[PDB]
Amino acid sequence: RVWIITTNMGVESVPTCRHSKLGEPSKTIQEVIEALKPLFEKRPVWTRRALLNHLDPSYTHYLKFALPYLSYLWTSGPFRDTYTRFGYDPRKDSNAAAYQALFFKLKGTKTHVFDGKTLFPTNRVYQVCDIVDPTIAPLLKDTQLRSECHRDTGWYRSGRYYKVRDLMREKLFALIEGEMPSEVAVNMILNAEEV
C-alpha cells in the first residue's frame, strides 16, 4: 500500500496532510520526496507521466511511494489522474484551468507534451499547460473561464472544452497509427460552431 488519499469533485475539503498510516520513509524514498518538493512549488498539480519526465529516471518506481507524502490524487473530474499538493484546491482557483487533465480512451514517445505531430505517443492523459500544439493551445488560452469549476469541464465552457477534446482525439487517432493528422480533415472540427 502506498497510502495515497484519493478525491473526487464532490469532496468538501481537499486533503491538507498525509495519510495517518504513513510513517517515516527510507532515505531512498526521502531523496525522491526532496526532488518532488520544488516541482510542486513550480506547479501544484501534476500527472505521474509529467513528473517522471522531470525526474531522475532511477525514481520511476519509487515515485508512487513518495507522492503520498506531499500530494493527494483525483480519481475523476477535470483533474483526474493528477497529484495535487496538500492544501491546494484547484476548484477554488481559476488559475488551475492551466492544470486540467484530458484523458483519451484510445488504443513510442513517453512525452507528456501534446504537440500534434510527434508519432506513436504512449501518454493518454494530457494537462493543458503541456499542450504546445499551436492550433489547439490558443483555444484554451483565449477562452473566458466559467465562474465556477464544473464537475466535468472544470473552468472551461462546455462547447469550447469539447471542441478542444475532439481536436486532440482526432489528432491522436492519426499519431498513434504513425500518420500526420490531416490539416484539412482536422480543420472541419476546428471550424465547427460550438455546441
Nearest to 98 by CA among 31, 155, 59, 162: 155
Cβ(51)–Cβ(83) below 8 Å = yes
Nearest-10 crossing angle of helices 158-175, 183-191: 170
Nearest to 97 by CA among 36, 139, 52: 139
The DSSP string of 132-169 is: --TTTHHHHHSSPPPSS-BTTTBTS-HHHHHHHHHHHH
Q: 57-74 burial string, b = 16+ CB within 10 Å, else e? A: eebeebbebbbbbbbbbb
Q: Rounded distance, CA 9 to CA 154, Å? A: 10
Length of the chain: 195
Tally of CA atoms within 13 A in the half-sphere of 137 that contains its CB: 12
Cβ(45)–Cβ(82) below 8 Å = yes
Q: How was this structure determined?
A: X-ray
Which value in Å is the resolution of this experimental model?
A: 1.5
Nearest to 167 by CA among 130, 129, 137: 137
Q: Report the SS3 class of residue 63.
A: helix
Strand blocks (E) in 56-111: 71-74, 82-85, 101-103
Q: Rounded distance, CA 164 to CA 154, Å? A: 13
Residue 147 CB-density burial (10 A; 0-12 exposed, 13-18 middle, 19+ buried): exposed
Nearest to 72 by CA among 119, 134, 18: 18
Q: Rounded distance, CA 144 to CA 160, Å? A: 10
Q: Which three cell numbers stand for residue 77?
A: 473530474
As for how many domains the chain has, the answer is: 1
Cβ(77)–Cβ(9) below 8 Å = yes
Q: Report the SS3 class of residue 36.
A: helix
Q: Report the SS3 class of residue 181.
A: coil
Q: Rounded distance, CA 101 to CA 77, Å? A: 9
What range does the domain containing 35 cover? 1-195
Q: Rounded distance, CA 69 to CA 76, Å? A: 21
Residues 41/99/79/186 CA torsion (nearest 10 deg): -160
Q: Which three cell numbers stand for residue 177?
A: 497509427
